[PDB]
Amino acid sequence: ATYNVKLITPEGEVELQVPDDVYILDQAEEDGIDLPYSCRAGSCSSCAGKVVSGSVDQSDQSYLDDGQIADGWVLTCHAYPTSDVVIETHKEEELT
Amino acid sequence: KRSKVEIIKEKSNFLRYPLNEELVSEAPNINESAVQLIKFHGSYQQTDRDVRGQKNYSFMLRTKNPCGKVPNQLYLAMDTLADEFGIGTLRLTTRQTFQLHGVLKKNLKTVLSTVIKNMGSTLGACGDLNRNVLAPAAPYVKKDILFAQQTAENIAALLTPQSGAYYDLWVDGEKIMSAEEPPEVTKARNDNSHGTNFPDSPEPIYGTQYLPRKFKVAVTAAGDNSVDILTNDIGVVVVSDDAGEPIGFNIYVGGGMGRTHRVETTFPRLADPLGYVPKEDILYAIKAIVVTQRENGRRDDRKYSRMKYMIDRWGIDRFRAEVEKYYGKKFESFRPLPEWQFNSYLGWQEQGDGKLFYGVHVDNGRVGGQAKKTLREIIEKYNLDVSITPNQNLILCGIDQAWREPITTALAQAGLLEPKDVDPLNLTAMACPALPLCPLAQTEAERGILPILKRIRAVFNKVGIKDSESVVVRITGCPNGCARPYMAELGFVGDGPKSYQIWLGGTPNQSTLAESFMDKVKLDDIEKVLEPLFTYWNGTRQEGESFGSFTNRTGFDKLKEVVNKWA
Numbered sequence A: 001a002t003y004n005v006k007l008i009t010p011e012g013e014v015e016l017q018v019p020d021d022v023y024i025l026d027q028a029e030e031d032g033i034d035l036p037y038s039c040r041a042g043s044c045s046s047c048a049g050k051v052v053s054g055s056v057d058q059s060d061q062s063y064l065d066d067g068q069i070a071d072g073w074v075l076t077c078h079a080y081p082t083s084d085v086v087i088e089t090h091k092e093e094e095l096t
Numbered sequence B: 001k002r003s004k005v006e007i008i009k010e011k012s013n014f015l016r017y018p019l020n021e022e023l024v025s026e027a028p029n030i031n032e033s034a035v036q037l038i039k040f041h042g043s044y045q046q047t048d049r050d051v052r053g054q055k056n057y058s059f060m061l062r063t064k065n066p067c068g069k070v071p072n073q074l075y076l077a078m079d080t081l082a083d084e085f086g087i088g089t090l091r092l093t094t095r096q097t098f099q100l101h102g103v104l105k106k107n108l109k110t111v112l113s114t115v116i117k118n119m120g121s122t123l124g125a126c127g128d129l130n131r132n133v134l135a136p137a138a139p140y141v142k143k144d145i146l147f148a149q150q151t152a153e154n155i156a157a158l159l160t161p162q163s164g165a166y167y168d169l170w171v172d173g174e175k176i177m178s179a180e181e182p183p184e185v186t187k188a189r190n191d192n193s194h195g196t197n198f199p200d201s202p203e204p205i206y207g208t209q210y211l212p213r214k215f216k217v218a219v220t221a222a223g224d225n226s227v228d229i230l231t232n233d234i235g236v237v238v239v240s241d242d243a244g245e246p247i248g249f250n251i252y253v254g255g256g257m258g259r260t261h262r263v264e265t266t267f268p269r270l271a272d273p274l275g276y277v278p279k280e281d282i283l284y285a286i287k288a289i290v291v292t293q294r295e296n297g298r299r300d301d302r303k304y305s306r307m308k309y310m311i312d313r314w315g316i317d318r319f320r321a322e323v324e325k326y327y328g329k330k331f332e333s334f335r336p337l338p339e340w341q342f343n344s345y346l347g348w349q350e351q352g353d354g355k356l357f358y359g360v361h362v363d364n365g366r367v368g369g370q371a372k373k374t375l376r377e378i379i380e381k382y383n384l385d386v387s388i389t390p391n392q393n394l395i396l397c398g399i400d401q402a403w404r405e406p407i408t409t410a411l412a413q414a415g416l417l418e419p420k421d422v423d424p425l426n427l428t429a430m431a432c433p434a435l436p437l438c439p440l441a442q443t444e445a446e447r448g449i450l451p452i453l454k455r456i457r458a459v460f461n462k463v464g465i466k467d468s469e470s471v472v473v474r475i476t477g478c479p480n481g482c483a484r485p486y487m488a489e490l491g492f493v494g495d496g497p498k499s500y501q502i503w504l505g506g507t508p509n510q511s512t513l514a515e516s517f518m519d520k521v522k523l524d525d526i527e528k529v530l531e532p533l534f535t536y537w538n539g540t541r542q543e544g545e546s547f548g549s550f551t552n553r554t555g556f557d558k559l560k561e562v563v564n565k566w567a
């Protein structure tokens, strides 16, 4: 399944199509869309975003606790879309 | 500001709590504090990343084996343990230790106590602690080789945690029989002449907070760079007299591989020559250096905690002066050394005492299947002690001449070949484990390197490069650098799901630091880069010039132009 992934960046709304077996960060970069990262292993806050609608499979991640995932935070390097999803990116500072 | 790990250390009662309670809970995993603490006891919780939508927890253990020396009894235990409690393999490492992957939490105590009780230890194999101390792996009886090895063993001993949490957790505080440490070590450890120690602490050297991060030392004899000395926090080199009698040591400081992609403030670094000390001083100088790091290394942000950063920030002269305050005297001038040479120690060689050794080439250090079974039969039948090399190889030590044929035969039946029968690219290649059990991996390394080597040989053939020719290829799944890819003639460093950052400029003797050449080269595309580089090397190198020397001489501008111009 491929989902509509709308990224709310400080620069604009970019809308991309991401497979449910492809990390959001990975697909974004493959298009030409510059997103923040460092470790790309779900172990930090570099790629942090907010889920504002839809769902993701980020069960590979390890940084965020259960409370923080319940609040809709996402590590975009380690997150598979499971629906159409809106994400506000560049939220590391907010977190953090 | 202090990192989360500093607080976990602070509140652990010298690495006991809450690891103690977590080890006995019904969960298959342990909590975040315990995850961090158990590293100090030489174990890492891991999950198998090949199984998705479900976390399969397991623990990896890593041994401590100064100089890579492994007694027969320990080898047999580790081999049995891998089959009974692990996933059937042993993993030889770039620091001369074993790792055993795949151990369930419920069996973890059984396995560490077995190691403890069969002449082994995993204490401080991980953690903010001194790591395995490297030395020449070859069992030569030559005086200065022997002296390198004894020196490495004393340093490991000097920097071993003293708090007792280790035996407390794993063998219920039992006394475990070990050979006595040389009086030299005890005496250096206890010296507080220069305010190095916390004499009221359960950890007189480490204190409550241990070190800011891992700390790595390598020891060698002049000329032998099997240890990749320049990548270490301390490099120690035996200096002899003309008659071969050790007189002192040259010391380098401040090397390290770890870096992070897009964080240009992190970088690999070569260790600087610091100075020379007479032989009796060595453990004093080493502590002085460790204490300087203990006291000054950053504890706010773990990316900048390694000693290489404080040396980059301070400069070597200010660093030296600080170290001398704890050594209580001045370093002498670093003494000139010969050129470094890489030594694999592979094949049939003489110890110098009438016996032979044989270096077993093992791709990636992975010992499994028939090869594992055959090595254990040989090692058991002949009661061999063994040694692990910093290139993830295994040396069979102490072999009678009359056993050469029977051993060679048994190894060949298992497909463990002599170097003449291995592609030279394999002999000098390394890869880290990466996927599936590394939590930090971005891509494959161990599981993809061998098809990459075959691809590189195919490029050589296509270009018309002879099959005896080679380059050092090292691959990691992420930029932490565990296979030391920043020293390679050709490094691939994982930087996306199937892409690598290519590094060039390392040399065959690991005397030079590679530089980032191109980013995000897709696995499928590697020949588009390689074929033109190796065409230009073959076409213009000087007679017998290695690819790394050629690289550094011609420079990146011309190299990128040759690559550009191919596409």
Ligand code: SRM
Pocket (backbone or CB within 6 Å): B044, B060, B062, B092, B093, B094, B095, B096, B097, B099, B125, B131, B132, B213, B214, B216, B228, B231, B255, B256, B257, B258, B259, B306, B365, B392, B431, B432, B433, B434, B437, B438, B439, B440, B480, B481, B482, B483, B484
């Ligand atoms: C097994 C080994 C690679 C190999 O193929 O042999 C290894 C494998 C791991 N290394 Fe390493 N490192 C291994 C030597 C290296 C070396 C090479 C060396 O020491 O000469 C380096 C570069 C030198 C250096 O430290 O700069 C190295 C740099 C790291 C780093 C980055 C450290 C840093 O300060 O930036 C980490 C990550 C960390 O510590 O945060 C890391 C962490 C790891 C972990 C434990 C991942 C983790 O943190 O959970 C590895 C587990 C992989 C797995 O599934 O088994 N490993 N690691 C080598 C184990 C050596 C040992 O017995 O102690």
Ligand code: SF4
Pocket (backbone or CB within 6 Å): B432, B433, B434, B435, B438, B439, B440, B441, B442, B445, B476, B477, B478, B479, B480, B481, B482, B483
């Ligand atoms: S270099 Fe990265 S991927 Fe490889 S073992 Fe080390 S931490 Fe894991």
Ligand code: FES
Pocket (backbone or CB within 6 Å): A036, A037, A038, A039, A040, A041, A042, A043, A044, A045, A046, A047, A048, A063, A075, A076, A077, A078
């Ligand atoms: S980049 Fe470190 S968590 Fe995604």
Ligand SMILES: [Mg+2]
Pocket (backbone or CB within 6 Å): B361, B362, B363, B364, B365, B391, B392, B393, B427, B429
């Ligand atoms: Mg090898």
